[PDB]
Write a protein that binds this ligand. Sequence first.
Ligand SMILES: COc1ccc2c3c(n(CC=C(C)C)c2c1)[C@H](C=C(C)C)N1C(=O)[C@@H]2CCCN2C(=O)[C@]1(O)C3=O
Ligand SMILES: COc1ccc2c3c(n(CC=C(C)C)c2c1)[C@H](C=C(C)C)N1C(=O)[C@@H]2CCCN2C(=O)[C@]1(O)C3=O
Ligand SMILES: O=C(O)CCC(=O)C(=O)O
Ligand SMILES: O=C(O)CCC(=O)C(=O)O
Ligand SMILES: [Co+2]
Ligand SMILES: [Co+2]
Lengths: 285, 287
Amino acid sequence: KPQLQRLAADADVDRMCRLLEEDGAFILKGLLPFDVVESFNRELDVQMAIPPPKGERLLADKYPPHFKYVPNVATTCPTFRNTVLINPVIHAICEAYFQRTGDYWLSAAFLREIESGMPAQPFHRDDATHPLMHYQPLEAPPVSLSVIFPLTEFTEENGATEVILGSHRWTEVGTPERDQAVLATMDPGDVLIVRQRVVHAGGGNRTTAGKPRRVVLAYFNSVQLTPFETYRTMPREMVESMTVLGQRMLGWRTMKPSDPNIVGINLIDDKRLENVLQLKAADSP
Amino acid sequence: DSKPQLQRLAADADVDRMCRLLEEDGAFILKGLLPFDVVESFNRELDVQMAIPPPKGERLLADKYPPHFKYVPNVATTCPTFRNTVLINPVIHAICEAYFQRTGDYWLSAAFLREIESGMPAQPFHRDDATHPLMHYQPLEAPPVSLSVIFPLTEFTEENGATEVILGSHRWTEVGTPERDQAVLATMDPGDVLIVRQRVVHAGGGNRTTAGKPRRVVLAYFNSVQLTPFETYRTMPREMVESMTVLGQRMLGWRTMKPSDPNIVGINLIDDKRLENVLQLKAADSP
Ligand SMILES: COc1ccc2c3c(n(CC=C(C)C)c2c1)[C@H](C=C(C)C)N1C(=O)[C@@H]2CCCN2C(=O)[C@]1(O)C3=O
Ligand SMILES: COc1ccc2c3c(n(CC=C(C)C)c2c1)[C@H](C=C(C)C)N1C(=O)[C@@H]2CCCN2C(=O)[C@]1(O)C3=O
Ligand SMILES: O=C(O)CCC(=O)C(=O)O
Ligand SMILES: O=C(O)CCC(=O)C(=O)O
Ligand SMILES: [Co+2]
Ligand SMILES: [Co+2]
C-alpha cells in the first residue's frame, strides 16, 4: 500500500510541489533543530498550564472535549513567532505553492493536545474555514496550505495524523473509512505538509499511560482570504520585534495578490499599511 | 422593441425582485434612495478632502494609472455622512442580506470617490472581481461573494460619462476587449444608486463635456467576510469607531463575523473570543 513520501529537509522545492499535486501530502524529515522544538514546547507548557477562560470560547464550545486547545500561538510563543513562522524552507515551499495566486499569509496557527483515551477526530478538509474554497476547480490557483508540526512523536498508538492520499480529487468528503488513510508517523522536528482539499484527521490517542500527543497546525492562506485569527491586537512592541516576513504573515503589512490585481490589498489612505503605522521591524532598521 | 436598457426601480421595491434582476440582467438602478441633502452633505465633506494639498509620496492606486480621474480613498474615515448614514442605509442592507444569504456575513471591502473633470477619457472595461483574482474561477452558480454599489453624487449623463454596464456580461467567461456600444448607460440623478453584480463588466464613461462641473461617483464595494478587505479600517481612532452603530462597526472589520456553514465557528476572531469583546468595544446603539 502506498505511503506518505518522506523527504530530506534540503530536498528540491519543485519536487515537493509535484508531490502535493500527485499525492496531496508529504513529510519533511528533521526540519527543526532539537533546541527549537524544545523551547517551543516549554512555551506551550506555559499556556497549557493556564486554566481555560470562564466566558465564551468560540471554537472549543462547538466541539466535544476530545482535545485541549491553545489558540493563536503566535501571540504567546516567541519561538513560533520569531523562528518557526519564518522558517526558510517552509517559505520556499509556500512561494512555489502560491506562485500563481500571489502573496500568502497566516490565517491561523494553534496547538491541540490529545491526551490518553481521546477518540479520533472526524475526517475533514481545512477548506471549511472559507466555504468558497469548495467551488474552486482543482486547476485553479491554490489558495490554502496546511503545515502540521509534530511537537511530540507521532505513532500508530498515540493517533498520528491520518491522511487520505489523492483525496483532493474527490468532489465531496463523504464518510470515509479509517483504513483508507495513511499514518503520518513522525519524530519531533519533522513537518507534515497537506495540500488544499486533502482529506485528513487526527488519530485519537490509544496509549494507556503517557504524555499527550502534541501537534501545532499552521494554516497559510492566500492574502485574498480573511485570516481566521486576527493578530491586530498584538502589542506594538511585540510586532515591531518581528522581522518583515513575520509582520507580513500576521497581517500588519500591505500584501499583493497576483494580477489582475495590480495595486495590492490591506492598504489604507492609498498608502502601505506599514508606512501609515510607521511600523519598525527587527530586520528593517 | 429597442435596445435593452438598465431597469429603474423605486427604492421601496421588493428585494427578491431586485435579486432576480441581478441574476437576469446583472445590474439595476434604484431611484430616490438617498435624500438630496444627504448627497449634498456627502459632497461637501468630500469638498474638504479635495482642498487638502496632495500628499508628497507613494500612492498605490493613483500611481498605477494615468491622470484621468481624481481620487479620494476610504471615504468612511473622512466623511461622517457616509460613515453614519449612507453605509448603514437599510435598503442597501436589505439587498445585501438577500444577495449574500448563501455566503453568510458581508462587510465593506472599499469605498472611494472618483472625480472626472471635463475632457478626461474613459475608464477601461473591467470587473471589480479583479481585487480578488480567485473570484474568476468561481462557478456562476456558486454563492456570490462580491457586490458593487455605485452612488452618483452628480448627475450622470451621456456627455459627462455615466457608468457603462454590459448587461448579461456576468455570463461571460472572460472580459476580453469589448466595444463601448455593447454597454448601456446608467444615467442617474443624485440620490439614485446603481447595483452591479459580481462578474458584470462595466466602466466609467469619461467626461466629454467641454465645460462644466466634474462627474462625481462613489463606489461602495461589499465582499463576503471570507475575502480580505481591500482597504483596512484598523487605523481608525477608537473614539470614531465607538461613535458608529454595531452594523457600521461590522462593515469596517471591527467585529467578529460569521461565514455560512461549514464554518460553524466564525472569522476575524482572536484568543478564541469575539474581537469586539477583546477590545471592549462600545457602540452608539449597543449600551
Ligand atoms: C482542535 O482543533 C480542531 C478540532 C476540530 C476540528 C474540525 C475542523 N477543524 C479545523 C479547524 C480549523 C480552524 C482549520 C478542527 C480543529 C474542521 C473545520 C474547519 C473550519 C477547518 N471540521 C470540518 O471541516 C467540518 C465541516 C463541518 C463541521 N466540521 C467539523 O466540525 C470539523 O470536522 C472538525 O471537527
Ligand atoms: C480611480 O479608480 C479606479 C481607476 C481605474 C481602475 C481599474 C480597475 N479599478 C477597480 C478598482 C477597485 C478597487 C474596485 C479601477 C479603479 C480595475 C481594477 C481592479 C483591481 C478591480 N481594473 C481591472 O480590473 C483590470 C484588470 C487588469 C488591470 N485592470 C485595470 O487596470 C482596471 O481595468 C482599471 O483600470
Ligand atoms: O490532530 C491532528 O493530527 C490533525 C488536526 C487537524 O487536521 C485539524 O484540526 O485541522
Ligand atoms: O467611474 C465610474 O462610474 C465607474 C467606477 C468603477 O467601475 C470603478 O472604478 O471600479
Ligand atoms: Co485539519
Ligand atoms: Co468598477
